[PDB]
Amino acid sequence: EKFRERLKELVVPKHVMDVVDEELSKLGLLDNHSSEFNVTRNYLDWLTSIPWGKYSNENLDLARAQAVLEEDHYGMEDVKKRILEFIAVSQLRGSTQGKILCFYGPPGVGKTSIARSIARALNREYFRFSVGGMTDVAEIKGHRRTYVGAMPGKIIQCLKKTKTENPLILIDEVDKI
Amino acid sequence: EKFRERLKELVVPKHVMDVVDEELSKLGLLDNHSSEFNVTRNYLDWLTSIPWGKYSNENLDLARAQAVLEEDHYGMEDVKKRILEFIAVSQLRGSTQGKILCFYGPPGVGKTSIARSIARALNREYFRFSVGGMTDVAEIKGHRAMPGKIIQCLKKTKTENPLILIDEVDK
Amino acid sequence: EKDDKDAIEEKFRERLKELVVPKHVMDVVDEELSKLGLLDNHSSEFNVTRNYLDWLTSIPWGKYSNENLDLARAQAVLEEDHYGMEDVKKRILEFIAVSQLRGSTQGKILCFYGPPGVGKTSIARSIARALNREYFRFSVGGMTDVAEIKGHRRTYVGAMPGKIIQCLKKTKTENPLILIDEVDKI
Ligand SMILES: Nc1ncnc2c1ncn2[C@@H]1O[C@H](COP(=O)(O)OP(=O)(O)OP(=O)(O)O)[C@@H](O)[C@H]1O
Ligand SMILES: Nc1ncnc2c1ncn2[C@@H]1O[C@H](COP(=O)(O)OP(=O)(O)OP(=O)(O)O)[C@@H](O)[C@H]1O
Ligand SMILES: Nc1ncnc2c1ncn2[C@@H]1O[C@H](COP(=O)(O)OP(=O)(O)O)[C@@H](O)[C@H]1O
Ligand SMILES: [Mg+2]
Ligand SMILES: [Mg+2]
């Protein structure tokens, strides 16, 4: 009952519901002290915890966004111009949109710090992970559900902590693959 | 009542008290001799074993905070001076955990033994938590009935502000 | 036949008298004997806890072998079994001397490495004779199961302790000489 209530506010796609509905039936027919019951409980907890159809309220005002960006950092006019253009595009579309941007430059210049300022100007949620010399693909997408003590991917773990489907994702050292 | 007499000796949060209160209610109806009739006592005993509101005075002074270091270890003048810098900023900030401290150097130089000296410097409770291999559900995640090592750390130190040293994080 | 619980409880207490049972171990034995009486004779849980009682009592608690703390006698045993190996023999003799001055038995971690066929596995049995310690051998070569050392949880059907625990029951003393063979091939 509690997990059904926690899905009420979210806007769940149809393919999400059938997976959730079928696992609920499996959870019902299991036993309390079953090892796979905990696995089913752990898996079902993650599905409901992930936000579905929940987007954070964006900030779509150029005046306040530009003022916020100026106070946080000095210079970076090329980055600031792109962010101001990003907000203007969202106004014409009438709906939130996403983009893939790259900040390259000398270390310690402000590439990581400016993105944190970007999130607050856009009222988004900030999450950071690094890929410097990645070795395991399991970091991005987690482990399979059958594995004992498995966990979802870091991106999936981001939606749980951010509690929204519109976060700001930062990637570090794409030139140090 | 023996569990309750220990419970009333220390401050108990209201949120945890309701969970503790219901555990006694179930345990009274149980026969205390079964797989589930014994885990409730284990669950309850681990609850009352955890300290709440009990702590040791921190940051006693700065003059004799140094005095612990010199008689515990020789040399490491730069390392010792850095710790006093961390202790000084901690007192001004009024917060125990400001940032994570790590020590890197050649093996067998004395990094592990420093932490024991640090705990005596500002009157903490030392606890070493070293890891050799990386496994998910082995050391923190616990089970379910094996409580996590962090929970066991507070019980054996009987304080709300212990000192936990993580050793060999790279390995 | 008489009452099964009374005979089972009394016979298990007989084994505990000779041992030096730790307080926490004694409490665990006492609490499980309390639930043994209330359980039925043919109940499955009765048989599960009965084996748990047997394993706990079988462990030698506070029992140590009468080690041979005689440097002259220890040398005689070592030289007759093997030739040479002065570095190993001298280390063993120095281990005996330290135990004398400390006044109590002690345990050490030793590793012998070298080319095959130089006497590493065969000197281990000779050392046990010199030290008058019971000898147990267990090789870890090609070992992929952790339950061999740590056993299985009592809830599992057919679950058994690790052979280190089975080492103590067979050795019957808390001071064996366990030879962990082929550690480099784990
Ligand atoms: N400056 C020193 N003053 C006094 N004793 C010292 C000093 N440096 C090292 N020691 C002694 O040497 C021992 C070995 O140091 P320790 O075990 O702390 O090393 P470590 O850096 O933690 O090792 P590892 O790399 O194996 O984790 C210490 O326990 C201590 O007794
Ligand atoms: N110094 C020695 N004196 C008498 N016999 C010896 C000596 N060294 C080895 N041997 C005998 O030779 C054989 C060597 O086998 P052993 O198991 O001792 O070798 P090992 O060094 O353990 O080899 P591996 O590394 O392959 O396990 C045994 O019969 C052993 O008793
Ligand atoms: N223009 C700027 N305005 C304000 N702070 C800055 C500026 N440039 C750099 N900084 C500071 O310097 C640090 C730069 O580190 P960071 O940008 O995270 O390194 P990297 O560029 O390698 O990601 C940040 O913590 C930030 O506070
Ligand atoms: Mg160390
Ligand atoms: Mg050999």
Swiss-Prot record, chain B:
Disulfide linkage: none
Function comment: ATP-dependent serine protease that mediates the selective degradation of misfolded, unassembled or oxidatively damaged polypeptides as well as certain short-lived regulatory proteins in the mitochondrial matrix. Endogenous substrates include mitochondrial steroidogenic acute regulatory (StAR) protein, DELE1, helicase Twinkle (TWNK) and the large ribosomal subunit protein MRPL32/bL32m. MRPL32/bL32m is protected from degradation by LONP1 when it is bound to a nucleic acid (RNA), but TWNK is not. May also have a chaperone function in the assembly of inner membrane protein complexes.
Full protein name: Lon protease homolog, mitochondrial
Subunit structure: Homohexamer. Organized in a ring with a central cavity. The ATP-binding and proteolytic domains (AP-domain) form a hexameric chamber, while the N-terminal domain is arranged as a trimer of dimers. DNA and RNA binding is stimulated by substrate and inhibited by ATP binding. Interacts with TWNK and mitochondrial DNA polymerase subunit POLG.
Family: Belongs to the peptidase S16 family.
Localization: Mitochondrion matrix
Linked pathology: CODAS syndrome: A rare syndrome characterized by the combination of cerebral, ocular, dental, auricular, and skeletal features. These include developmental delay, craniofacial anomalies, cataracts, ptosis, median nasal groove, delayed tooth eruption, hearing loss, short stature, delayed epiphyseal ossification, metaphyseal hip dysplasia, and vertebral coronal clefts.
Domain notes: The Lon N-terminal domains are crucial for the overall structure of the protein, maintaining it in a conformation allowing its proper functioning.
Residues bound to ATP: G105, P106, P107, G108, V109, G110, K111, T112
Residue span relative to the full protein: 419 to 594 of 959
Tissue/organ expression: Duodenum, heart, lung and liver, but not thymus.
